[PDB]
Amino acid sequence: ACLSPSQLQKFQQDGFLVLEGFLSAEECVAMQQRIGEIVAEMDVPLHCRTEFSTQEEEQLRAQGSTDYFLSSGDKIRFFFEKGVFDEKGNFLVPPEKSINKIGHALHAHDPVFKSITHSFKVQTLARSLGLQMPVVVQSMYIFKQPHFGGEVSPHQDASFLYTEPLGRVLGVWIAVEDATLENGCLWFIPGSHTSGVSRRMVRAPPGTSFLGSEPARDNSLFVPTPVQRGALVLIHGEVVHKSKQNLSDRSRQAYTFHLMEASGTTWSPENWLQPTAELPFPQLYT
């Protein structure tokens, strides 16, 4: 759908905006169903396929893992929960119960997610926001598995998807399932999106690292945004947000993608994600 002038100001004020009912139940279920099929056909990545003996083993595993992620910008790959593994690198429960996320080109290589992503609803919302040349830089599906579904510590999306100038990358988060206080809903600091980023993640000339550091911020400045299935949350590139671990007996599935306004904008050559000749960042508008 489409933004009223009061919704638009509320977004510039807060750095996020909750639009309940953005997608229908059946759109949500389309996503849940295709992600099931993708997970059912998942092959366990080479680096997770082996127990490790030593320090020399855990570092070679850690590197293939880095390689896998870095080259995942134009793929549909699988990223597993940090702590679903034992002392010697083995899965504690089956890998299909242990996925944390899938990324980072669902919007390009899956017909269902491409559909949702380039839908009329999204294209019209983007026009309300006034994006000239929005392109889709990234997408991903977050499972937030029950009981151990990982927390996401406070951050700003621009720390990872940096551009000159700032104010050019926008996050879209769609709730495929109900997001509650219990199961890992998002939290923001409203108004935190107006003094740049404290930290960025950079890629090596193979590897990643951080410039700067995330400051400490009083937990009391975060507000919860629980929402029902189908809600869309808009996320400014610089708003500070987090999610707690899912301590509940049900997941908190979500699909998210990021838009960059390509007009006058420089994508940092140091970002982990770079467009390939196979998939340059595709235009949103069709």
Give the chain as a 3 state SS string: CCCCHHHHHHHHHHCEEEECCCCCHHHHHHHHHHHHHHHHCCCCCHHHCCCCCCHHHHHHHHHHHHHHHHCCCCCEEEEECCCCECCCCCECCCHHHCEEEEEECHHHHCHHHHHHHCCHHHHHHHHHHCCCCEEEEEEEEECCCCCCECCEEEECHHHCCCEECCCCEEEEEEECCCECCCCCCEEEECCCCCCCCCEEEEECCCCEEEEECCCCCCHHHCEEECECCCCEEEEECCCEEEECCECCCCCCCEEEEEEEECCCCEECCCCCCCCCCCCCCCECCC
- Furthest CA-CA distance within the chain: 59
From the CB of residue 221, how many other CB atoms can be counted at a distance below 10 Å? 14
Q: Which residues are annotated as a binding site for Fe cation?
A: 155, 157, 241
Tell me the CA end-to-end span of the chain in Å, nearest whole number.
16
The Cα 105–Cα 41 span in angstroms is 17
Residue written as tokens 């893992």? Answer: 65
Residue 208 CB contacts under 8 Å (≥ 6 apart), including other chains: 66, 70, 201, 202, 272
The Cα 92–Cα 96 span in angstroms is 11
CB of 169 closer than 8 Å to CB of 157: yes
Solved by what technique?
X-ray
How far from chain centre, in Å, is Cα 265?
21
CB of 126 closer than 8 Å to CB of 134: yes
Sign of CA dihedral 164, 11, 256, 152: positive
Burial class for 118, CB neighbours closer than 10 Å (0-12, 13-18, 19+): middle
Side-chain-side CA neighbours of 62 within 13 Å: the count stands at 8
Burial class for 22, CB neighbours closer than 10 Å (0-12, 13-18, 19+): buried
Closest CA to 154 of 244, 237, 235: 244
The Cα 47–Cα 244 span in angstroms is 28
| β-strand pairing of 232-236 with 152-155 | unpaired
Q: Resolution in A for the shown PDB structure?
A: 1.9
Domain span at residue 39?
Answer: 1-286
The Cα 116–Cα 101 span in angstroms is 18
| CATH of residue 89 | 2.60.120.620
The Cα 244–Cα 183 span in angstroms is 8
Q: Residue 156 corresponds to which amino acid?
A: Q
Q: Which residues are annotated as a binding site for 2-oxoglutarate?
A: 101, 140, 155-157, 173, 243, 252
- How many folded domains does the chain comprise? 1
| β-strand pairing of 266-267 with 169-175 | unpaired
CB of 237 closer than 8 Å to CB of 198: no
Q: Which residues are annotated as a binding site?
A: 101, 140, 155-157, 173, 241, 243, 252
The Cα 148–Cα 247 span in angstroms is 6
